[PDB]
Amino acid sequence: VQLXXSGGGXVQXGXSLXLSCXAXXXXXXXXXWXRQXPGXXREXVXXXXXXXXXXXXXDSXXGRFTXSXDXXXXXXXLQXXXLXXXDXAXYYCXXXXXXXXXXXXXXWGXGTXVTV
Amino acid sequence: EVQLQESGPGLVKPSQSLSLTCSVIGYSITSGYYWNWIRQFPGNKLEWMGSINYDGSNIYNPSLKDRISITRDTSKNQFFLKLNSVTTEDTATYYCARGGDYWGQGTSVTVSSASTKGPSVFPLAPSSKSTGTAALGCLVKDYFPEPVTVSWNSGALTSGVHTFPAVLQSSGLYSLSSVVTVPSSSLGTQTYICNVNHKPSNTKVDKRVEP
Amino acid sequence: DIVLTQTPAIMSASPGEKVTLTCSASSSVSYMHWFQQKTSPKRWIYDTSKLASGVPARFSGSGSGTSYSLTISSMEAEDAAAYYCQQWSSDPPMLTFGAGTKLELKRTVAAPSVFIFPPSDEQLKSGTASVVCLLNNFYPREAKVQWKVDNALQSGNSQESVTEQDSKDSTYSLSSTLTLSKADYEKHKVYACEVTHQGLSSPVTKSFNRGE
Ligand SMILES: CC(=O)N[C@H]1[C@@H](O[C@H](C)[C@H](N)C(=O)O)O[C@H](CO[C@]2(C(=O)O)C[C@H](O)[C@@H](NC(C)=O)[C@H]([C@H](O)[C@H](O)CO)O2)[C@H](O)[C@@H]1O
Numbered sequence: 001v002q003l004x005x006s007g008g009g010x011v012q013x014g015x016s017l018x019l020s021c022x023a024x025x026x027x028x029x030x031x032x033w034x035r036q037x038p039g040x041x042r043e044x045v046x047x048x049x050x051x052x053x054x055x056x057x058x059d060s061x062x063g064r065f066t067x068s069x070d071x072x073x074x075x076x077x078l079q080x081x082x083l084x085x086x087d088x089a090x091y092y093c094x095x096x097x098x099x100x101x102x103x104x105x106x107x108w109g110x111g112t113x114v115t116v
Numbered sequence: 117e118v119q120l121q122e123s124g125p126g127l128v129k130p131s132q133s134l135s136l137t138c139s140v141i142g143y144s145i146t147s148g149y150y151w152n153w154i155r156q157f158p159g160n161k162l163e164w165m166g167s168i169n170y171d172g173s174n175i176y177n178p179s180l181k182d183r184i185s186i187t188r189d190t191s192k193n194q195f196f197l198k199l200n201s202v203t204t205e206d207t208a209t210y211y212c213a214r215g216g217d218y219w220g221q222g223t224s225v226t227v228s229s230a231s232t233k234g235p236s237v238f239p240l241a242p243s244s245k246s247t248g249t250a251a252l253g254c255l256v257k258d259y260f261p262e263p264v265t266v267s268w269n270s271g272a273l274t275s276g277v278h279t280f281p282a283v284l285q286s287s288g289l290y291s292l293s294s295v296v297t298v299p300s301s302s303l304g305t306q307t308y309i310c311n312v313n314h315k316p317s318n319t320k321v322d323k324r325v326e327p
Numbered sequence: 328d329i330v331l332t333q334t335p336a337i338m339s340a341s342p343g344e345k346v347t348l349t350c351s352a353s354s355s356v357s358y359m360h361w362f363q364q365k366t367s368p369k370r371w372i373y374d375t376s377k378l379a380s381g382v383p384a385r386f387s388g389s390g391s392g393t394s395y396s397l398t399i400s401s402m403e404a405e406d407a408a409a410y411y412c413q414q415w416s417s418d419p420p421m422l423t424f425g426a427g428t429k430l431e432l433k434r435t436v437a438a439p440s441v442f443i444f445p446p447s448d449e450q451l452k453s454g455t456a457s458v459v460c461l462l463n464n465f466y467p468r469e470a471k472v473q474w475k476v477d478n479a480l481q482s483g484n485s486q487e488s489v490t491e492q493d494s495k496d497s498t499y500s501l502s503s504t505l506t507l508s509k510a511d512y513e514k515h516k517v518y519a520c521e522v523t524h525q526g527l528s529s530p531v532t533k534s535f536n537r538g539e
Pocket residue numbers: 148149150151152167214215216217358360373374413414415422
């Protein structure tokens with residue numbers, strides 16, 4: 001079990017960014033996205049539950065971001081649109097070890113830099 | 117088209133029975149194909165165990181026929197696996213599959229007489245000779261069962277981190293280490309703490325690795 | 328009954344090369360199937376040469392009797408996985424899998440950075456002494472680790488662990504743990520780890536004396 005996030009970079013205000021994270025089986029577990037400013041704490045961004053259990057988003061990223069998941073590729077995705085300077089942070093991916101979605105976030109990723 | 121999902125206990129005592137259930141969605145098990153149980157040992161070796169057909173006939177691996185049973189429940193569209201008098205050699209990840217073209221996610225079953233135990237965490241202090249790149253880590257020794265998670269600096273240190281797969285010692289417990297390579301210029305200014313988390317024992321250890 | 332022998336065990340390939348995996352059977356085989364696994368095993372080639380869902384055209388299957396093959400015309404980085412040949416027999420009913428061929432992505436040769444770690448005082452208070460030898464970021468994976476205490480080669484008292492091929496730099500990391508009791512550990516002085524790898528002109532030894 002290991003996670004590796006990808007897809008970040010540098011981008012101007014208003015443009016997009018598609019993040020991805022592969023797992024080293026996650027079809028039964030939820031994959032959440034978290035971000036952290038250099039001088040702040042990790043805040044929740046989005047969470048893709050199991051296929052059919054829909055998705056959930058924070059208040060900061062409602063309408064602008066879209067979370068997805070490919071069970072066949074054991075990967076999660078996070079499409080980001082209309083990026084603001086406030087969204088600039090390091091983005092992490094975690095697995096909710098509890099199948100009941102209580103959020104036992106045990107496994108975490110290396111992270112990816114995002115700067116606007 | 118067809119979806120499959122295994123479910124069952126992940127820990128079994130030796131000389132006792134292991135039972136698993138495969139839930140099928142999108143296709144009736146009475147329509148066709150063989151419905152097999154296939155496991156994979158830690159050595160990544162695959163072994164087909166048994167099968168039940170659409171008409172209910174059974175086919176078993178001769179190496180397991182004295183202690184295997186494959187039943188089904190067509191009302192719930194499920195088929196089950198029962199392995200009797202299991203040994204530690206039966207520790208593997210079990211899959212259910214339809215005729216070999218659709219597989220489940222896989223359930224990890226461990227057979228052991230070991231009881232739940234929290235791990236001892238020891239610092240792997242950086243040596244006296246460090247140019248350059250220094251190496252430090254933590255030793256997570258003697259625990260049961262799998263798995264255990266390790267972070268560094270509450271997740272603030274991910275680059276250069278390597279947490280090795282656990283090894284089953286002769287005592288029946290698991291042991292691993294998590295190492296991280298850092299600049300030698302940071303050993304005097306930057307603090308390094310490893311965070312070990314083992315859920316079955318509800319233990320959380322934070323050990324500072326000092327030069 | 329029927330034994331499948333897959334050759335080679337590990338296959339290192341760069342993007343753009345032709346890869347051929349062989350699966351030999353002890354007795355004649357009507358049809359050989361192939362499975363990919365990175366994750367549940369996915370059906371990749373069935374009925375010797377039919378391509379399953381999601382398989383690029385660069386893959387190809389062939390063979391008959393006692394020898395079957397899987398061919399990749401131009402290998403890609405996404406093709407790095409384990410490939411198992413599978414066979415089904417009727418008269419003695421048995422579904423046999425091969426041991427699998429590991430196709431890995433090839434990168435440049437990197438020698439391991441070796442490190443030695445003496446047992447901590449906290450571990451010695453429990454009567455056990457663990458000496459850890461760390462081999463970091465090396466490729467290819469083939470290596471050798473020897474434990475020599477007081478210039479005496481050790482055997483049967485070390486356990487090795489290797490990580491999977493890294494997702495970023497495609498390297499390996501290895502740890503070798505030597506386990507002793509504090510009584511046996513305190514009866515010697517020189518503890519050394521001798522590392523052998525194809526990127527090293529000579530073996531690299533990391534030693535330490537007990538009380539230093
Ligand atoms: C559409 C398709 O891909 N069909 C393949 C499938 O055949 C099914 C049963 C077909 N729809 C049908 O005839 O109804 O699988 C066959 C392979 O058949 C056998 C084989 O002889 O190798 C049948 C045998 O009974 C199976 N045994 C068990 C225990 O399941 C095996 C086995 O499933 C495979 O070897 C994989 O483990 O398959 C063929 O590939 C069709 O193309």
